[PDB]
Automatic annotation (TrEMBL), chains A, B, C:
Pfam families noted in UniProt: DsrE
Xref: Gene3D superfamilies: DsrEFH-like
Protein name as it appears in the record: Uncharacterized protein
SUPFAM superfamilies tied to this protein: DsrEFH-like
Amino acid sequence: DYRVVFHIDEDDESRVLLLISNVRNLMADLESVRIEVVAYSMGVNVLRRDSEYSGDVSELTGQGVRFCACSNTLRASGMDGDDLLEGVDVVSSGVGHIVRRQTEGWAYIRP
Amino acid sequence: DYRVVFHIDEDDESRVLLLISNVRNLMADLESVRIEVVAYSMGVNVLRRDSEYSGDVSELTGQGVRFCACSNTLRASGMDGDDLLEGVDVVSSGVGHIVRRQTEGWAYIRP
Amino acid sequence: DYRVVFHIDEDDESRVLLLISNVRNLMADLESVRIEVVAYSMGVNVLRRDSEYSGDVSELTGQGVRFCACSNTLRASGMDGDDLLEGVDVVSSGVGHIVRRQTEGWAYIRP
């Protein structure tokens, strides 16, 4: 049924909690939905193992939500896959993945 | 012809005036366009009866613009439909409505 | 192949550099992609001849990136085409152009 990819590139608290809230809201309002969360730039800090949002990220991952980190930004930010929480996947490009997804018919949400 | 849904989740002045401006600009640049404005989180404060933007909201409603408040956020914010300006509609979910709309072919704008 | 239009309506440094970075990242991660950057409101200041980002804008233009300024905002901002960097094009409406593009199948990215 529904397919949607979220986009977050900041790590300020209110924006992060809004994304989280939007992801949960969406899973409850739509019968069937596939969700991906693409985070790049400062936004990747949310996917770090030492992140204050790790509980939220690990829990949603268990519910089928796929979090994607940008292969490029990572380097740019002195980060590698070892710094990311378990369950978080890496895509070659945050924006590229978003464009591919949109091109494949996925809906786009930028909280 | 054209169908577009706007997304606003903040209530800071500059962002609100930008949305308003974008809605009017759009109605003047496109021959035929159907417009919906989905506001959630802090963004719903813009749809309140006591809002400083009530004049702008009521006027655009008269021009065919449909403003939608999130059924969930409302509660979360200690609000119910009685707190909303007349003409403002309530959708079950702000993000869900946006995803359904995008899925139905509507364009998406996030000022 | 891929077609994408970026949307920027602010001129704060971090947001501008993020857009620039996203445009370059995209050109390197996608084999074939057509890119347009629509800037309105404060965002048009980025397309000014006297802008600190002129080097970045002129360079990307040479690489095929099309920057578009909003015909309306310009006036609203006491600006005309003479104030814009060479290579920057003017569209009748920033949001309208974005809606037309999305309607034509282009992907949308709002950094």
